From a paper:
To explore the fate of sheath disulfide bonds upon contraction, we solved the atomic structure of the contracted sheath. The structures of the sheath subunit in the contracted and extended states are similar and can be superimposed with an RMSD of 0.7 Å between 347 pruned Cα atoms out of a total of 491 Cα atoms with an RMSD of 3.9 Å. The larger all-atom RMSD arises from the different relative orientations of the linker arms invading the neighboring subunits’ SHD. The rearrangement of sheath subunits upon contraction resembles that found in other CISs (roughly, each subunit rotates and moves radially), and the integrity of the two-dimensional mesh created by the sheath linker arms is preserved. Upon full contraction, the Milano sheath subunit rotates by ~12° and moves by ~13 Å radially. Two of the three disulfide bonds that crosslink sheath subunits to each other are retained in the contracted sheath (Cys14SHD–Cys244SBD and Cys216SBD–Cys327SBD) whereas the Cys47SBD–Cys182SED bond is broken. This suggests that the disulfide bond Cys47SBD–Cys182SED needs to be released to allow for the rotation and radial movement of sheath subunits during contraction. We could induce contraction by a mixture of guanidine hydrochloride (3M) and dithiothreitol (DTT, 5 mM), a reducing agent. In the contracted (post-attachment) state, the tails were straight.
Milano is a contractile tail bacteriophage that infects the pathogenic plant bacterium Agrobacterium tumefaciens, an important tool that is widely used in genetic manipulations of plants. The contractile tail of Agrobacterium tumefaciens bacteriophage Milano is flexible and bent to varying degrees, which sets it apart from other contractile tail-like systems. A contractile sheath and rigid tube assembly is a widespread apparatus used by bacteriophages, tailocins, and the bacterial type VI secretion system to penetrate cell membranes. In this mechanism, contraction of an external sheath powers the motion of an inner tube through the membrane.
Numbering used by the authors:
A (entry chain D): 2 to 501
B (entry chain D): 281 to 501
C (entry chain D): 2 to 56
D (entry chain D): 281 to 392
E (entry chain D): 57 to 224
F (entry chain D): 169 to 224
């Protein structure tokens, strides 16, 4: 041995038990993967970093791109889990036809916003280039991560979705070069965008109880527009918020792209989903915006559950970039109608005709919850902050109450002697009240009357005579959580007169 | 059925933790992630939770100690099982009369501790000659009377409130000492035999805390 | 489940029963409507805001 | 006749509330929005009040437990029915002698 | 123990929802009459839907209500299939779809099945807009018949007292 | 001996990559049989008290 340790007078132990890393940001991104991927479908798998995305979940798949956005959004998250899904057996891949007609007579630049700003192409067309050469150039310039395999044929670019299903039906190629003053589009060249076939049969897994059995997830991101699949995820997260079994909470993030009538019809009373209302003319691939929103919400949960993912600072999906326009997607009438019916509305950070790229930010960070079990329009779970913070409060109160586990419980008159691992309902209630008062300004607001808001009863004073069981307690806590903060109606009243 | 750890290892850890509590705090319940954590055992984490909560409730209902992972995850670490409930397999009386006297392992451990402590206290009256309950034993005489015996027993019991019992509804009517003369028929009871009845309240285990959170969002209601 | 909730020692319920909105101002406005409207005549209907009045 | 809820559900809630009182307070009358509120049952609100008040008075007169919605509205929420009167179907003696000994369900529970 | 969606199952579910944590609830299950006839209701749906919307239905109690999303162009068959798939299994009426007609057959024979009230609680709603097209109609094509008449309480409940007897 | 559970806790791991090829399978070709039934506690543990008895 080593001197001073050989005589056994000093016995030394290292104990590396403090320095174990916490999980982090438990976000489960679910989406279809292409057959190029090495991941096993229908199995929740940890995704360490952005490196293995293409290898594991397919090159250019829906899950690959949504995971890329989740990794771009949060700080340095590695606890991103994924749930790859297989394409439906009879699924049909959407096919778009970007047909180009020429020939070009003058030089110029041909810029195209396909999908997101990460996939935009910017080619240089010279004079006399036929439509075939321009289509070949655009195909060669299409990013491989674009979830659409591009093939050129005599000037028609066929973009076939990498994933079968309706998820391919939301491609918006914008020829963001027309009328530009700086980048002059070539004379001749005409870009036209058609969608020759539509997506079809989608996955409907409905296996969350088996795949995600008790492995809790703060945020579930669904990268499918299928309302049946969204409904299955909703039912799963609703089961996760159930008094019947031990709740290990979560919150789902789905999108609903369509006309105002269609979006509103796709909604229900789901406090478990934060439905993201997207207009029909939404340029960005919807699951990318949904993934950014869910990733931002998760990356907040890890830090500040009371935060509302909302506004240009806290709800800014900076990874997403869509071209600026004067036509504002949802008109303000539609915005008010959507926010009224529990829909998360997202809008451009800046409006302009200069044709820059803008990052969408979330207008309201709400769940799709409007009304109680009596339909009794209620406000308990209107905010996504409310779900996140009710989960945080329940978990914090449970972890505090776990300190009374194992302690033997005396009557509320007994003065437990020192050295005895014990407590009585009076000491329990005192410690609970001190805990709650310790979380004022962190997890609750103040307390109207902390004595009458927190009550602890034994099972003997709740159940009938000789029916209550010993060691069972009933704790009622009427707390006031922070509210989201929806609108500030400012009424400016200029005063110009001095003698009135 | 799908329990990964060799079962006798978890059983031995549980029994060793219970013993290692007995030596210190008999009133302790080997239960929860702090006091009933079998830290020596380590099983791989899984999302499939062994017993489903329906089976957990059915087992805890029928006097079974249920044990569960300390943490649930899909990251595939190792987790130490902790004991959900520290109960014995006792549900019902000799009349089958579903009863709660020995439901907790704490109850058996603590009834043993209480019996032994009361016996070791009562051993101090062994050898003492017993006078009638009116005699005022002179000093230097190794003696006692049922009145002094009952007074010392009541003082002992009141000394163990908060250590071995809870408080006493009525310590005068909970602890009674009778001679064998006022229990047996006339001229049938034997001298020097006593009957002590003690109706105490032991600490209970503490099984569940039904917390009912009620968020209040309105200011004018 | 979730740690501290898996052992069933703490059973938790949320109870969103306090935070239900009151009706408000119960005023019934009765009057003739034109045939352009989509409302069913002779039926008391809630009017949420000024937006759907014309419709 | 126009009762929306399956009737045996409301009957079971009423009987369960009465039992769950017996265990505690036999003198309690399962009646009103606090003590006779069948909170498990939820029926849609309507302006047509099931029994009209004439029928309500006629039923309560002839020893019938009448139950009504906790709230009336046209907003179409769900409301929990509560018991108007907690009475037995007892009106008259063995001489038919209209009597009041066992008119209340509280009276039967409390005589027991 | 008492069947999935039976009358006794649902009444017991309400008894357990009502009282605090009662376990001394006793039950007295009864068999359907030999010649008992199950009530049959026909919720007939006509379309197709032309606009999207929500179709909400209060069948039985609020525990059994359905709330489906109908999209534009959904035929009556798809809407009936959706409503059937959304009908809770505890609902005491087995639901089968057939070309847009939902046949709800009582799980228990007897007159006890004759008290189903399906309310299309979505018509005229300002918040949940019912789809254009879709028409819900509720008919009861057959009535319940012969009921149990046990008359065996003296033997079944001989001296085992019961504070409350609930008859479903 | 009938309660052995070998888990190939390496499948699908992101950090420790299991080799391609290798397949681990676990079968239990025979079952345990006749057990000890001592029933001699009165003689072996006559009055030597024991706070905890652990049965393996």
């Amino acid at each position: 041995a080593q001197d001073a340790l050989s005589d056994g007078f000093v016995r030394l132990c290292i104990d590396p038990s403090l320095n174990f890393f916490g999980e982090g940001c438990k976000i489960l991104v679910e989406g279809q993967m292409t057959d190029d991927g090495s991941a096993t479908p229908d199995a929740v798998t940890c995704v360490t970093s952005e490196l293995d995305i293409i290898e594991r979940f397919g090159q250019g798949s829906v899950l690959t791109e949504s995971l890329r956005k989740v990794f771009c959004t949060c700080k340095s998250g590695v606890s991103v889990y994924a749930l790859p899904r297989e394409d439906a057996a009879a699924g049909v891949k959407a096919v778009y036809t970007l047909t180009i007609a020429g020939p070009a007579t003058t030089d110029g630049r041909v810029q195209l916003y396909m999908g997101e700003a990460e996939y935009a192409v910017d080619i240089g067309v010279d004079a006399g280039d036929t439509a075939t050469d321009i289509a070949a150039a655009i195909v060669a310039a299409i990013s491989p991560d674009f979830p659409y395999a591009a093939t050129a044929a005599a000037g028609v670019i066929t973009l076939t979705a990498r994933n079968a299903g309706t998820i391919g039906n939301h491609l918006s190629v914008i020829y963001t070069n027309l009328g530009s003053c700086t980048s002059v589009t070539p004379e001749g060249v005409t870009v036209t965008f058609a969608q020759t076939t539509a997506g079809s049969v989608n996955p409907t897994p409905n296996d969350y109880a088996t795949v995600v059995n008790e492995c809790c997830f703060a945020v579930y991101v669904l990268s499918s527009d299928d309302t049946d699949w969204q409904e299955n995820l909703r039912d799963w997260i609703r089961s996760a918020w159930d008094c019947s079994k031990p709740q290990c909470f979560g919150h789902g993030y789905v999108f609903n792209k369509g006309t105002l009538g269609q979006v509103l019809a796709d909604g229900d009373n789901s406090a478990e989903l934060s439905r993201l209302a997207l207009p029909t003319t939404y340029p960005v691939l919807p699951y990318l915006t949904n993934a950014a929103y869910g990733a931002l919400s998760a990356c907040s949960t890890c830090n500040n559950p009371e935060l509302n993912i909302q506004g240009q600072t806290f709800g800014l999906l900076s990874c997403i970039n869509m071209p600026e326009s004067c036509t504002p997607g949802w008109t303000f009438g539609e915005v008010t109608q959507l926010q009224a019916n529990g829909f998360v509305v997202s809008g451009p950070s800046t409006t302009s005709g200069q044709g820059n790229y803008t990052s969408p930010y979330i207008y309201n960070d709400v769940t799709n919850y409007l009304r109680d079990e009596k339909n009794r329009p209620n406000a308990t779970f209107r905010d996504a902050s409310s779900r996140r913070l009710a989960a945080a409060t329940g978990v914090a109160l449970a972890e505090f109450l776990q300190q009374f586990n194992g302690l033997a419980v005396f009557t509320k008159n007994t003065n437990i002697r020192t050295g005895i691992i014990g407590t009585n309902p009076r000491l329990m209630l005192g410690k609970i009240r001190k805990w709650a008062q310790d979380n004022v300004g962190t997890l609750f607001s103040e307390f109207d009357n902390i004595n009458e808001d927190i009550q602890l009863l034994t099972d003997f004073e709740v159940q009938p005579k000789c029916v209550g069981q010993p060691g069972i307690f009933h704790l009622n806590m009427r707390y006031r959580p922070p509210v989201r903060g929806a609108r500030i109606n400012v009424n400016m009243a200029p005063a110009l007169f001095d003698n009135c």
